[PDB]
Amino acid sequence: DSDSSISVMGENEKPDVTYADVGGLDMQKQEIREAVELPLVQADLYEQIGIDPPRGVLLYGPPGTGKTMLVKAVANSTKAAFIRVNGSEFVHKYLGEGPRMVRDVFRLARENAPSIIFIDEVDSIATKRFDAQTGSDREVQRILIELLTQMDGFDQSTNVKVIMATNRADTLDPALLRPGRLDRKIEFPSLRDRRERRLIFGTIASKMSLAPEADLDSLIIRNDSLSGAVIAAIMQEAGLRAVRKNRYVILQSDLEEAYATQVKTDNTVDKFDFYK
Amino acid sequence: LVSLMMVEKVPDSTYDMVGGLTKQIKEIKEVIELPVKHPELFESLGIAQPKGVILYGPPGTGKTLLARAVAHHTDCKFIRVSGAELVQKYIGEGSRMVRELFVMAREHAPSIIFMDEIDSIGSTRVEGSGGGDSEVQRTMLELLNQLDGFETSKNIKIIMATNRLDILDPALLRPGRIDRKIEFPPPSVAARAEILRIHSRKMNLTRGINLRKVAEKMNGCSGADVKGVCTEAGMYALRERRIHVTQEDFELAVGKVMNKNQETAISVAKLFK
Amino acid sequence: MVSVMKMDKSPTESYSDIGGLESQIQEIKESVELPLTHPELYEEMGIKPPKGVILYGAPGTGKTLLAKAVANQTSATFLRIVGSELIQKYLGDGPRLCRQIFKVAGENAPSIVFIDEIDAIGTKRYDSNSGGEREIQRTMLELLNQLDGFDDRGDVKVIMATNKIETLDPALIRPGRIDRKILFENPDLSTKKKILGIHTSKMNLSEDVNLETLVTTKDDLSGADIQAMCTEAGLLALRERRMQVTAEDFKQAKERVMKNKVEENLEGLYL
Amino acid sequence: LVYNMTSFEQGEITFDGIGGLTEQIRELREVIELPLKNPEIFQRVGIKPPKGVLLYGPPGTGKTLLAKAVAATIGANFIFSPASGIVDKYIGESARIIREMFAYAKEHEPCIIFMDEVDAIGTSADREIQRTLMELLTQMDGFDNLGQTKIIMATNRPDTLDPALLRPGRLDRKVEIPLPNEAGRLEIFKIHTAKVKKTGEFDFEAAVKMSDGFNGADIRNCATEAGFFAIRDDRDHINPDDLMKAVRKVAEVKKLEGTIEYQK
Amino acid sequence: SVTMMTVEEKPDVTYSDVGGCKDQIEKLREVVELPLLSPERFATLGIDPPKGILLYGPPGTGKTLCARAVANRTDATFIRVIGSELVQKYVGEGARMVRELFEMARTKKACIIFFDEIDAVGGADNEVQRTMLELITQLDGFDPRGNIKVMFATNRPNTLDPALLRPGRIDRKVEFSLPDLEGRANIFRIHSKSMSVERGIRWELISRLCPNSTGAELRSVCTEAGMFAIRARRKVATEKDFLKAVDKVISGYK
């Protein structure tokens, strides 16, 4: 069926990322494939044990931090169906475009037996409960409940269990997450990773190049604000300097300024202006 | 449209998959069972075979999972709206479908319906802000109680449902328009006991098993947590290559609930004692 | 349009079996019936009796029970429509149809009509700048102007209804057209009085009567649920197999159903 | 129909038309050299390109002019799309149109896209609109690939929003351009005295003398301002005392509605 | 041609079948009749006459009785312009009505409009404005120097762009409102002139009991007293009968 609101993504037009483009993250990357990649294959064991396949996840943590990097290397290794979506298309200018489509959405999956989908972000959709103040917002919650019955209302097993990406995981309208509706929920931290910063800081250096007149893994020693998405963003900028001067590969004096060339703006009167 | 209609492909559930729930079937079957099982019996008195009923209670229950099995062991039909699908991005589509709805069941007296959610048709207020949805709650209730509904109430009982109760229109309920309601509470501990007996039917001539030793401990609300902890218990056995399973491997699975039973952080605000 | 209209099937709702009230009900028979008995009397002092009435809501408190009882009595036509069923995608379809009643009211001098729960038509005159929904506002004007453009009133009768007025209905109604803006709500005793005045018909109360205390302590409620109160005693009879009619198990239903809908009860402050 | 935006490209026009603060002019060109003329370098290192950039400069300083010139350097389709111009009370109309924007965009590459006044981008209404701000940023680098199509946000209210700037790895080259000195003000007259007659002398010393706060648009308007009543002289050259009869009042409207300009 | 029928068989109205405060009638009677019948009074000063009596009055007031009054008086032809026949789903076909109307109207004589309830169509994916534009094209042409006027009424004067309502369209506008007791008294005489009563009593003190209110309730409230008399079997009416229900009509409303 056509249902021209989302097409089969990745038949031949797909991204090209790998599992190994990540650094570590196996503290979470293990469990997810412990409930994704195997049920493709060892379904008989899930019949030997487990009244149903544990599936349904809510991946969270702060955004711009590592969530969506992992979402799609699996897309490179499905041997099965896969769909993307902008996670707020459902907010249509008029009414009804979702409830007409969302019922046609899973209609795409049930025919595409088996498959998987995902979502960009649902920060606008998380809404526990309001008193009915206006229809301006009530077209949100009606979609959310309809999503739920569309998930495990009646159709039980042949469907696919799905994901939940976000930018926060406390506003989430409860009665969505459940031991049966999801049966899984994971994240990953932001604080210092001596074990992971020590390798992710140069896992990309394999993808990059470097001619060491000295040792350049020493900014890792300088632990103040170990983040997750900057730590490749820097050399995503620092490499633009040897080229800026026709230098063929960078030097370690080229990047230490590039570290601070991303000025951390620790001094800003916008912080000083408010309280005092 | 007949996609909403009932099924020649019934689900396969049952109201003895449903441990802990023991009394409610006796309290609610009869309005759905007895005088329709025996109208002459009821008509011996013939007080009023009432209109539908309602069920309120939190999630974690399987009010749904109850309503899947009742459509087995029926003698009647069990249609489904796939809740809130009836509405569209227009006006005229509302009332016609409701007009189409009742008549679809007039032709089948021994046959009934299902809602899951009425959070989206609740508490109509209007001063310019509102919506056409409020228009449709009337006509269904109108054709519920009018010159043409009691003939359905001669033929029909029904049910509504939701998970949040007091956030809707009281002008809906003329008690008698809905003649009975009930709570589906969270379970007792010992009510939780027979649950895991249902779903973990996977032990392999094992021993040292104390199914009572888990509702020993719980203070939750859901019964589904008995599955959420059970279903991922076997995951441990699934990863460690040994199909077998025990108590302790099954017990720390609550460590997943160590978040749920402890995710609710607390405020230190001693403004008032 | 015509198909739904001619609902000539009055139920066994028995006018005068109902035990509610009198003054209201003479007021309609005076509004309607007696005018169809000896209207020369209106011609004696030269009276144009009213063009229908409008009750109020207080739901579950006797909106309609008379009405199908009147239909049981109607001795004339009886009509029935819904505004939500009246409306359509296209422009002015229903408004083009709304006209077509009054000629079908021109069908008869015995021309009368109930109307079904206007709350989505003629509710309130918001500007409706936000598209689309001006159709409703475009429709009410098609009626009221049709209603009193130039009419001898042709027994073009009417009786309306809703559940709440001040929520809606700002300007549509006008006196003379609808002079009688009238009421139905709880009696504060007479639910005790004549409701079981009816329901004493079937039942036996196979040990006593007990009715001297199966009574109202000024309890805020709606007597419509009394038709539950009769019910569950029979059920609780058959929760314990009493084929007869008791008075003891009957206790619970008020203690059970009236107890759910709790009130604040903050009267430790007006003493 | 967004032709109305994307149809100001074909006529080749010089990148020389603005001197400005050249080191910034050296920045954005050299960093956008790479995809077109020397894309070998990204390969020899194997590093991703700049996934789009932004800038800042206060109002009326050739910002759109700067952008409108670059597309003619190489043959993109310079669009024009005001932020506030795409603003409708309809909820999805915000987030629906943007998706069709990238749609036609990726339908035509190697091309270019532009925004200026995006600085506008617990309450009831606001809880939906952040999703738009949460949507498009995702549509930059959320799931899809982007071959030869880029973007600039070029505002005048640099207190825009923390999160778009909170993680400046999504965007980069978060550049600034301040207003001229004599260093800048002087050479700008050379292009603005290009196609017009004049006497010939070091007359621009008044330029560095005054105009400490004007921008390029009004001095251009000051040029033509002088030429109007310079025809009463009617001479075959033009004198720098001529303009002096109007440099005052142009500042008195530059006086009008005093607005500040911080950089961030 | 749904409304292709000028006037009814018998308008039963008079300018003295109304209390109507006596003042809102004069200029209305002046604009409609004095250019019509005595343009020498116009050229007595050499005037720029008007073309329309702009109007707003809350419904349930005898403007519409007043509207049906000029019908029965002048004896000329008449119209009714309402969204039913006017507004039609077929885009553009709706404007066949206005054209066949006005292009006819310029031909005819004393065919002045009562196009009431233009608040329906004249309010601000909707095509109503283009019909409103279809109007004003027709009016700026003939607008001055004619026996014809444009006099109608509404319920919501602040519900329409005045881009149409420039001074050459409806200049000497109209405003209605409830009466004094004396206005409430003389109107009360009217509907009192049918029945049997306790003749010769102090009716006027009841018009003291006319706060902000319509005359429509007064022609009503007398009949409820007769209804009260009907249940009372009072073959002839008294004072207290009028009281026994009028005390209830407002309190039931209040």
């Binding site: - | 006006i91 005229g92 | 689309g132 | 309809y90 209404a125 | -």
Partner: peptide, 15 residues
Amino acid sequence: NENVSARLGGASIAV
């Protein structure tokens, strides 16, 4: 032979 349709619609916008 037809193009003369026009159906109303429903919206709900922030006030």
